[PDB]
Scaffold this motif. Sequence first.
Motif, PDB file in Angstrom:
ATOM      1  N   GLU A 269     -11.808  -8.996   3.781  1.00  0.00           N
ATOM      2  CA  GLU A 269     -11.143  -9.525   4.531  1.00  0.00           C
ATOM      3  C   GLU A 269     -11.655  -9.307   5.909  1.00  0.00           C
ATOM      4  OE1 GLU A 269      -8.081 -11.282   4.558  1.00  0.00           O
ATOM      5  OE2 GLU A 269      -7.944 -11.467   6.740  1.00  0.00           O
ATOM      6  N   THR A 270     -12.498  -8.192   6.289  1.00  0.00           N
ATOM      7  CA  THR A 270     -12.922  -8.144   7.732  1.00  0.00           C
ATOM      8  C   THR A 270     -14.217  -9.038   7.617  1.00  0.00           C
ATOM      9  OG1 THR A 270     -13.651  -5.877   6.675  1.00  0.00           O
ATOM     10  CG2 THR A 270     -11.830  -6.001   8.454  1.00  0.00           C
ATOM     11  N   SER A 271     -15.243  -8.857   6.472  1.00  0.00           N
ATOM     12  CA  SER A 271     -16.136  -9.625   6.457  1.00  0.00           C
ATOM     13  C   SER A 271     -16.083 -11.176   6.616  1.00  0.00           C
ATOM     14  CB  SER A 271     -16.774  -9.486   5.079  1.00  0.00           C
ATOM     15  OG  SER A 271     -17.316  -8.031   4.789  1.00  0.00           O
TER      16      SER A 271
ATOM     17  N   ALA B  12     -11.825  -5.486  12.911  1.00  0.00           N
ATOM     18  CA  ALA B  12     -10.847  -4.106  12.845  1.00  0.00           C
ATOM     19  C   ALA B  12     -11.059  -3.708  14.209  1.00  0.00           C
ATOM     20  CB  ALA B  12     -11.816  -3.361  11.592  1.00  0.00           C
ATOM     21  N   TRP B  13      -9.759  -3.472  14.751  1.00  0.00           N
ATOM     22  CA  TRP B  13     -10.118  -3.378  16.236  1.00  0.00           C
ATOM     23  C   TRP B  13      -9.947  -2.238  16.652  1.00  0.00           C
ATOM     24  CZ3 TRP B  13      -6.099  -0.235  17.221  1.00  0.00           C
ATOM     25  CH2 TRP B  13      -4.991  -0.163  16.265  1.00  0.00           C
ATOM     26  N   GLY B  14      -9.731  -0.993  15.598  1.00  0.00           N
ATOM     27  CA  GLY B  14      -9.851   0.312  15.975  1.00  0.00           C
ATOM     28  C   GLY B  14      -9.481   1.331  15.015  1.00  0.00           C
ATOM     29  N   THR B  15      -8.635   2.550  15.538  1.00  0.00           N
ATOM     30  CA  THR B  15      -8.250   3.455  14.803  1.00  0.00           C
ATOM     31  C   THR B  15      -7.290   4.672  15.446  1.00  0.00           C
ATOM     32  OG1 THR B  15      -9.052   5.296  13.023  1.00  0.00           O
ATOM     33  CG2 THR B  15     -10.331   5.037  14.880  1.00  0.00           C
ATOM     34  N   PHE B  16      -6.814   5.393  14.550  1.00  0.00           N
ATOM     35  CA  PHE B  16      -5.815   6.221  15.304  1.00  0.00           C
ATOM     36  C   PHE B  16      -6.201   7.737  14.778  1.00  0.00           C
ATOM     37  CE2 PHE B  16      -3.022   2.732  14.668  1.00  0.00           C
ATOM     38  CZ  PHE B  16      -2.534   2.274  15.896  1.00  0.00           C
TER      39      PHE B  16
ATOM     40  N   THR C 199      -5.546  -6.687  10.976  1.00  0.00           N
ATOM     41  CA  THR C 199      -6.843  -6.955  11.660  1.00  0.00           C
ATOM     42  C   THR C 199      -6.787  -8.388  12.279  1.00  0.00           C
ATOM     43  OG1 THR C 199      -7.706  -8.228   9.610  1.00  0.00           O
ATOM     44  CG2 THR C 199      -8.166  -5.748   9.576  1.00  0.00           C
ATOM     45  N   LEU C 200      -7.795  -8.522  13.115  1.00  0.00           N
ATOM     46  CA  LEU C 200      -7.938  -9.676  13.991  1.00  0.00           C
ATOM     47  C   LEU C 200      -8.731 -11.095  13.246  1.00  0.00           C
ATOM     48  CD1 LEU C 200      -8.884  -7.839  17.460  1.00  0.00           C
ATOM     49  CD2 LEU C 200      -6.733  -8.750  16.536  1.00  0.00           C
TER      50      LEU C 200
END
Length: 435
Positions: A249-251, A311-315, A419-420
């Motif tokens: 997906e991100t690729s 993938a804009w980031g994380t928590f 995801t973006l």
Amino acid sequence: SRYEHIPGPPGRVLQDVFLDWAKKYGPVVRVNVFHKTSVIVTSPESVKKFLMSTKYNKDSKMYRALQTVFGERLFGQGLVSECNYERWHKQRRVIDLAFSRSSLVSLMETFNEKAEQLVEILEAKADGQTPVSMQDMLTYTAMDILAKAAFGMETSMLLGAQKPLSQAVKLMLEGITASKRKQLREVRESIRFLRQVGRDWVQRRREALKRGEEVPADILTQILKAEEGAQDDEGLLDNFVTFFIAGHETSANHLAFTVMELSRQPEIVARLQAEVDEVIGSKRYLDFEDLGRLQYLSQVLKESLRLYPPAWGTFRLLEEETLIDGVRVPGNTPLLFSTYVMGRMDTYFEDPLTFNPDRFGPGAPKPRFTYFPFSLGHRSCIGQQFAQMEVKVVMAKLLQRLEFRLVPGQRFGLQEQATLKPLDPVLCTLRPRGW
Ligand code: HEM
Ligand SMILES: O=C(Nc1cc(C(F)(F)F)cc(-c2cnco2)n1)C1CC1
């Protein structure tokens, strides 16, 4: 009330709202993500402190949306969504073996074959008139690569196969963000479908092993290995789905954003075309050593991830009350990190909205904790080098063979699920290189 003292508000996406608030309210801002109050932390000092320590773990409350959707187990306790350190660490170390140098080098044939197939399909359409969704075409390519590389299966999406499968992925991703009657039905059935695909492909692998057929060690090998003595196959299926989705997906999104941006960058494209011409010439096949020589392409892809991180980031979970950049943040709080936000802040990047690959040039100062498209620390992307290799192969083959023009009216805006990705399908017309 416990958060009210924290600074904050009393094709445009949630990440853009966050960017505005970080600019307006500073490095520690209270927001609302996935129903809960979280705190967006955007100083490099904080990025370093929280991402580069095994003391800070992912926040399970923020990953619940990946674990289960509308009562249907999705990513469950797979590698992305497992928040217990010891449970994560066990599976990470086992699966790591599939991403060894030698493992990834052996994948070059798969990368090349799928990229070549894509280019041949596009070449036949390169009449400067036929509109082609590059988002779709790149998604099909990424899926076909992943299915073969990770699971040894042929999805043949580039041949127009597996339409229901592509539908299932789309509805499932919409589902993650959603969390009426018909939407629930569609999302739930999609999730069950994907897990059933898992059961099917797992059974096929086990059959091959029993009949003593040749099975090249892949991601699936290690996913099976990680579950060697489990009560049931639910953990196995968690990881199947995780890798099935995360692995393409991100690729796909990264490729689409890059093509989209490059459509308005003719000078950069000319430079990229020249580099590919000089390094690989007319060769059909990129060797592993060729990848390292595509230095300008590497820079363009890095700059693409600065402005357009899929993938804009994380928590991370803050367990105890802590002072973060002069702000008292209570214990048991999700901290949100965003490479999207930091990438677009002038305090971190001069002229942030300018696409300039020279930011990543050999002699340029490297971003220090202001850029993390694959995250950082122990929970960084296991698939980082896999992704970097496959996207370079795809991009190089496109640049070798084709010219792309974005159809007028196509937008450069974003849409946000988990995801973006491009808002629009990245509709292009194509011509073969050389008039
Ligand atoms: C350009 C493409 C990619 C980008 C930008 C990307 C980005 C990321 C990011 C930001 C994370 C951290 C996620 C989080 O904290 O919730 C992550 C983790 C992960 N990614 Fe990727 N990724 C990419 C490609 C891939 C590929 C190709 C695979 C698998 C073949 C993959 C599998 C994973 C997995 C399993 C994790 C969880 C790792 C762990 O926590 O131990 N990704 N990736
Ligand atoms: O949603 C999150 N992570 C996340 C989600 C997804 C999804 F849902 F699109 F499958 C995919 C990846 C990924 C990582 N690497 C490749 O894909 N990561 C966290 C909570 C913010």
